[PDB]
């Protein structure tokens, strides 16, 4: 009974691999060889946001690229004014073991979650001026790892129970559920068109999900370890993945295979966070060796190293306009990096 | 402009004051992680020590001993795989490990679980408080003798009771009960350095001194960590 199904699955996998190999007209390195290298890139800490007690496990930038929300393991959700370093809010969390945070595009809502399996949404825009829990979502058995906002009414959530769910603010119910993974889903990123999103789990694979339809589009393989962080390239037509094998891979929605592998022999620490710049040329990825390396998305070269952190970096985010990058770490400090002409 | 900046500065000052006020509260409490298999009586020791009080996924238990706040966290409705969320507990004072010593089948699984925790890169500076629960069950099993240890641990035949052992009781039960203790000690010291140490304790289903042992071990961990900062030890 199961033998025929296994044989059919193996044949389908072989056909998919053959189709992917046939489509490999060339590689990114050959076409990018005749391009100007990015060269050395210098990053200097402009602002140092201090005040968190425990390690930071997640941060997110606002639409205005001025207010950022940081989540730490002491149960505090602090919103920072990056321009003036002032703390505009300090939201105490019911559970200290938080793992993710999200800022709504409108800026009136902020979400967080962790081992409690509870996605707590806070209404920042209130008349009394005191932040309160808008509602709580309880539908995921596994630990909550990531959460992102589609709009003021819809939120996409990634859990560690190999499932992804989409919720609504009005009723707090799962409109759709994505069940196609075999490992813990760590992080997910929403494409700019907001039509579809991609995610990566603890199975060395990534799946592209359709929000409205609710079914997986394509799957991606090639990584040797669990996928830790995922980001969408600006054009929304590609995404990058990071794993514990000290290697970052780039995937394309049309080629359905890896584009270019970013790795170094010296680097042996896994990835914790990854994000792209405004133009997408600069790829910033977290690492467990207490620093962040800027990777050229085309030439696959280390443009620079962000070695201003004592402990390993867990989160990093780039502003909407690309003005500055904020890299959180386990040293309870947030660093804002920028260049100079 | 000036008024808005002054208001923002005042709000930041208030937030910083709240953070400073809540720093002492955060530092006072000692975070603990409770781990163990299904056969281990984690719930028994959770309910027995709950008398010291001051879907879900993770449970929180708060108990006070000697006017010291102690918060321990027990993982509930979570998946079997634990290589990812275990990194969140790197800052805990100690990790409480409950082992069923009266099974002889899951004991190897407990040994493998100890190997993963001890050799974890992030769980390298955390001392492990070993709780050998169900020692009453180990004692009765030894006397009747249907199930032995040699068939599961061949080296038990050549094992000898250590001189430093202090039996509280026929020689058979203490020889086997200390043999399991020797197995756990040798695994902890096989590759672990002086950064962290394993504290083994003998636990039953009716003992009420488990909270005292945790407080004593946590105090020792804090004292050793202070000495490590001073580079004296």
């Amino acid at each position, epitope marked *: 009974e199961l033998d025929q199904l296994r044989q059919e699955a193996e044949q389908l996998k072989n056909q998919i691999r053959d189709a992917r190999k046939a489509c490999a007209d060339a590689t990114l390195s050959q076409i990018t060889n005749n391009i100007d290298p990015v060269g050395r890139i210098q990053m200097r800490t402009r602002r140092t946001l201090r005040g968190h007690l425990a390690k930071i496990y997640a941060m997110h930038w606002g639409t205005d690229s001025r207010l950022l929300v940081s989540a730490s393991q002491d149960g505090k959700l602090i919103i920072w004014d990056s321009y003036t370093t002032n703390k505009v809010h300090a939201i105490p969390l019911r559970s200290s073991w938080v793992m993710t945070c999200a800022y709504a595009p409108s800026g009136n809502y902020v979400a967080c979650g962790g081992l409690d399996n509870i996605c707590s949404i806070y209404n920042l825009k209130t008349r009394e001026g005191n932040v309160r829990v808008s509602r709580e979502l309880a539908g995921h058995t596994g630990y909550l790892s990531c959460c992102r906002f589609l709009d003021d009414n819809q939120i996409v959530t990634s859990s560690g129970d190999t499932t992804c769910a989409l919720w609504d603010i009005e009723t707090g119910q799962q409109t759709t559920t994505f069940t196609g993974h075999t490992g813990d889903v760590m992080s997910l990123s929403l494409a700019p068109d907001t039509r579809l999103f991609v995610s990566g789990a603890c199975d060395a694979s990534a799946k592209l999900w359709d929000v409205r339809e609710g079914m997986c589009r394509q799957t991606f393989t090639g990584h*040797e370890s669990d996928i830790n962080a995922i980001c969408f390239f600006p054009n929304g037509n590609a995404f990058a993945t990071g794993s514990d094998d000290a290697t970052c891979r780039l995937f394309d929605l049309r080629a359905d295979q890896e584009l270019m592998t970013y790795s170094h022999d010296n680097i042996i620490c896994g990835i914790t966070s990854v994000s792209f710049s405004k133009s997408g040329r600069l790829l910033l990825a977290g690492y467990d060796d207490f620093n962040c390396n800027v990777w050229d998305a085309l030439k696959a070269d280390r443009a620079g190293v962000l070695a201003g952190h004592d402990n390993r970096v867990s989160c990093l985010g780039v502003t909407d306009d690309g003005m500055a990058v904020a890299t959180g770490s386990w040293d309870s400090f947030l660093k804002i990096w920028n260049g100079s002409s | 402009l000036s008024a808005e900046d002054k208001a923002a500065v005042e709000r930041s000052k208030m937030i910083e004051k709240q953070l400073q006020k809540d720093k002492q509260v955060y530092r006072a409490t000692h975070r603990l992680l409770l781990l163990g298999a299904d056969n281990s009586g984690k719930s028994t020791i959770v309910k027995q020590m709950r008398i010291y009080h001051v879907t879900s996924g993770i449970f929180e238990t708060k108990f006070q001993v000697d006017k010291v706040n102690f918060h321990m966290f027990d993982v509930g409705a979570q998946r079997d*795989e634990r*290589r990812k969320w275990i990194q969140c507990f790197n800052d805990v004072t100690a990790i409480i490990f409950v082992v069923d010593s009266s099974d002889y089948n899951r004991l*190897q699984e407990a040994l493998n679980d100890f190997k993963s925790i001890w050799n*974890n890169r992030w769980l390298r500076t955390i001392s492990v408080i070993l709780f050998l629960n169900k020692q009453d069950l180990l004692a009765e099993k030894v006397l009747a003798g249907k199930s032995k240890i040699e068939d599961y*641990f061949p080296e038990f035949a050549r094992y000898t009771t250590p001189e430093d052992a202090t039996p509280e009781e026929d020689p058979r039960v203490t020889r086997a009960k200390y043999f399991i203790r020797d197995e756990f000690l040798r695994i902890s010291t096989a590759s672990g350095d002086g950064r962290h140490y394993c504290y083994p304790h003998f636990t039953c289903s009716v003992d009420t001194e488990n909270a005292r042992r945790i407080f004593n071990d946590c105090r020792d961990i804090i004292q050793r960590m202070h000495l490590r900062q001073y580079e004296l030890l």
Partner: nanobody
Amino acid sequence: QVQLQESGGGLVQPGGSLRLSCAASGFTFSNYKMNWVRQAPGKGLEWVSDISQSGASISYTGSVKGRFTISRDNAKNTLYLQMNSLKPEDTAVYYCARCPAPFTRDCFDVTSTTYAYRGQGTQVTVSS
């Protein structure tokens, strides 16, 4: 795609000897520690033995200590497990498992019900 294909097993008289091999692809064999686990019928998965990246550190469980020999071939990217003098309680499904992360000596979810880095396994049966 990371996959493991166990080869070997079959019907062997008790007290006999058989050799089974683990094929690996899609990852660096040398950089990843490899383990051997067992799942007896009516029982959960249990650990048997593991081999280090270079083979310097080798360990076995007490139940099979001094009975099985594990060999690791980095050049041939395959894991070997030689067994002799079997027992009637040794019949089970032998699963070839890989540690989740490289360059680390800790492997947490190797003996997991729904582990991802493990093969389909080969049934071994011993009986008179």
